[PDB]
Structure formats: C-alpha cells, structure tokens
Subunit: 153 residues, 4 copies
Amino acid sequence: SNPIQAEVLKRVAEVFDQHVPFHNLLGLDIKRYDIDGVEVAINMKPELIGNIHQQILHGGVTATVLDVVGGLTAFAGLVASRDDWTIEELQQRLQTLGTIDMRVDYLRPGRGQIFTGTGSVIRAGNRVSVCRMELHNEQGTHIAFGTGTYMVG
Amino acid sequence: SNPIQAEVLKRVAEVFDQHVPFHNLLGLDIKRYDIDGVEVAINMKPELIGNIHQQILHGGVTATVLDVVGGLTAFAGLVASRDDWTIEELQQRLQTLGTIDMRVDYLRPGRGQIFTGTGSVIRAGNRVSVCRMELHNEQGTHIAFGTGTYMVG
Amino acid sequence: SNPIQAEVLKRVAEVFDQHVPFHNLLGLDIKRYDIDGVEVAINMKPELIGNIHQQILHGGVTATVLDVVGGLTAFAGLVASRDDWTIEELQQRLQTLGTIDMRVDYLRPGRGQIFTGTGSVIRAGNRVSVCRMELHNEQGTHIAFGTGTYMVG
Amino acid sequence: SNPIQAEVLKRVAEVFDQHVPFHNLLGLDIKRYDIDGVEVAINMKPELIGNIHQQILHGGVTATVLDVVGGLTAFAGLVASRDDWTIEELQQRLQTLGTIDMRVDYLRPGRGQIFTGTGSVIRAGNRVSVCRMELHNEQGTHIAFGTGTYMVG
C-alpha cells in the first residue's frame, strides 16, 4: 500500500503494543495490524483471574481487550480510507482517537490458555466510527462480543 | 440489616477486596460495602496509564471498576430484597452472580489520583437486575457512566 | 420440526403478525417464522418518514423492528432448547417474554420500498437470552444492527 | 438564551411537532423546548399498544420517544454551547443531527394514560454528544431509561 500508510500501520501497532502501561501490566500484545483486521492476544496468567473457584478470566480483562481491538480497528479504517494522509495529519488523528461508548456482551465463562480478539468497522466515519469486536480462546470458543463507538477525528 | 444480611456482605466484601487476583493486580479496593450499596476506590499508579502523554486512565480500568461496582450493587440489592435469605442460598447466589451485558459511556479524560465508583439498582429482579454505575476522581468530576445487566439468580 | 414446537411457533407468529395493535399501525409483518429463526418485513409508506427533506425511514421504526426480531429470535431459540415442551409450558413462557435492554447501532439512512429484519441468538438461556438483530434495505445493505437481552423465563 | 438560539429552537420544535410524518402517526408532541432541554409527551391510544392483555405501550414507542428526546436534548446542548451561532450556521448543524447508537433499558411495563420524556447531556461536544433519556407516565412512574450518542457536527 501507500508508503506512509505502511509506516503508521507498523508504528501504531507498536505504539498500542508496548507504549501503553496497562497493556504491559496485562501482557496484551497486538500480534498484527493491517488495512483489514487487527489482532490482539493475551496469555492466561494467575494475575488475570476473577473467580478462583471457576478459575475464569476477570470480566475486566475481556472488556479491556475488546476496547483495544475496536480503537485499533477504527483507526486502521481511517488510515485505509485515504492515500493523501501526511504524517502529522495522522498524528493529530491518533491523539484524538478515543472510545466514546462501548457495549460488551459476555457469552461464555472466560476459560482458556490464550485469548485472541479481532474486530471490524460496521460504520466508517471521518470523525466517528463504530466497530464490532470479538474474543475467543485457542479452541476458537467465543467468550464475548463487543460494539464500540470511537472518535477518529 | 439482620445478622445474615450483614455477615454475607462483610464476607463478600473481603473476598472482592483481598482474594481476587485481577483486583490485586490493579489495586482495586472495596472502600465501603453495606445493604445500601458499594464504594470502590482505586489509586492511580503508573501501570494503569493508557496514554503516557495525557497521563489518563486506560479505558480498560474504568470498565473494570464500573463492572465490579455494578455486580456488587446488584448483589447488595438482592440481599436487601428479602427478609428470609439463608447463608447457603446467598452463597449460591454469589457464585451465579455475573455480568450479562454492560455499556460504558466515557464522559471526560480519566485524570486523577484516586478514582471512586458507586452505583444503584434501576431494575431489581430475583434472576436479573440492571444497575447504573458512575466513576469519578478525587475532585468529584464524573469520568464515566455505566449501565449493567447482571444475572443474580 | 417437532409437532408441538412447529405448532407453538405457528401460533406465536400470527400473534405478532396480527394480534399487536402497534404492528398494524406500522405495517410490521412476520414474513416467516420457523425453529431456525425469524424474518420480519415492513413496507415503506408516507407515515413512516422521519425527515421529509430526505425521505428517510424514521429511526423509531428501525428500533421497533429490531426489537421484535430480537424477541422472536429469543423465543424461537427457547423452543428449540428442549425436545419435550408441553404446549402449556411454552404458553407460560410467552407470557414472560420481554426485552430487558437493547442497543441499536445506526449505520445508514433507511431508503427503499421494503425493509427486512433477521436475527440470531448469541447466548442461549433458560431465563435470559441475548440476541443480535439486523435490518436491511431492498438493495441488501444494512440499515442498522441491534443487540438485545431478553427474558425468556 | 439570546434571540438567535431561541429562534432556531422554536423553529426546530415546530418541525418535530407537526412536520414529521412518523410523529404525526404516533401522536408524539413537543410540549416544551428551550435551552434547558426538552419535554416530549405522547398520549396513550389503542394503536400504540403492544400487549392487549396487559394494556402496555409497545416497546418500539418507548424507544421512539427516548431517541427523539435524546436528539433534541443533544441539539439544545449544541445551541447553548456558543454565542457566535449564526442562523444558517445552526441550520446546517440541524441537517447533520442524527443518532449513532442508543441503549434502552426497560424497567417495568409501560402502563399509563400519558407518557412524558425528558433527558440531559452527559457529554457535550462539537461533533458528538452523549445523552441520558427517561420516560415516565402521568403518575411519575419511570417506564424506561435511555442513553444515546448523537452526531451534532
């Protein structure tokens, strides 16, 4: 794709990946990131448990992962929408990026070894975008669905 | 509250405040928990930051706090709804207690030193309850509102 | 499907299709209803326009259609839940069927002569079910998505 | 409110009260509309019933009223946010007014003779605003609560 569109796609992906303190506290990793769909994985660890008896992931981790998948999905959508994007142009956008509201639907108990989240834009906007997100375990079992409205400009 | 109601609440409160791995990871504390509702407090700390430049809370922490406030608010309301609960029935309820769906509305940037969450029951049920949650910093400004649907039976 | 199930689904269908005053005012029709799900449809007419200057469907209609699709989807999923329902049992359930909360995401302005809605269960339950709903124009594009939490018992 | 603000508001109130086909079909009325907010009312009539036996308002009507209250609430909050507003500058804004997403929480059966709705802005913006809505009957009993995200620029 566009030389600049590539930079941001490999930069923004790395920004979220390790430049965010909370992402590091949880061990959240943005595996990939490109024009279509981003991916976010998180390995199960004792620190992420909610109910010790059921040994299930705390609902806050599920929410966090879905929110991150959405913002990234939204911004990625903004990027691919143009070929005139300058560097500062997108930098101002990235500083504006934020969640306005989000809905999480908890489908099944959060059990698994590795969890992966992905999303897609259902409403692409120049200022506001809405996406749907999803979280599953290594067995492919859907743990939760999400829908978020993001500010992209 | 009668002995049963009081004792159950005291027990649940220490469970959430000391024996929940994810709560310990973030520093989420149950400041107050009685038949009237809950108060959850969380001190800002570097690991909870979402964007270093603006020094704001990661939307994930906010969602986590709002969700916990809702669950406990819904459980407190359940306990308060009957004069004939037994320790065993309420202990079974605490295990079934869970979030079905939740909406978080991000109002302002999450800046603060100490964050406090409280909630109220807008729809009480024997099986399903709906709660409204709020999060504010030590200055009293609202950071986010939440609405949660919880399975309570 | 099963004699009783197909019999109950048949009954419930004419109910929403004709026994509901608001459905007749809007022209809401239950195009088809089987154990697999539902498909609602509604023809455009002058009384359903929201903004005359744009000849677009009023959002209130959209939300109405999504919610009905959701309740029907939920109940259908419940019928297929057990294989030994008694016509009286399912009659008691239908009396408790109702929406707890619903989220509507508006994607495009509603245009065209006919609008069709369908949905699916994302979380099946004996007491509560969560469904996703979709509404689209005659050209196949999605006007809105919906997510609903329903009481099925 | 200065003359310009009050002028556009009176104009907007007129359009929604008489020049909106779907509002005229339901009988939705804009009782009052000023810089503070909006009051929407709708009398109960046979055509608005959802369940014949319970004589309750159809959930679609409740959702319709909450969305309209939210839109007008959002627009009023926009009108009151500035003084440099020129007549057409706000009329161009009105053309952009629309609902992005909405969540409705059904608290209890919609019984009543006259239903009234009010709302407030929980997040005011130059392009996106979030609002809370509420519907009650003539006795003051709360029927449903809403939360809407609106495009205002």
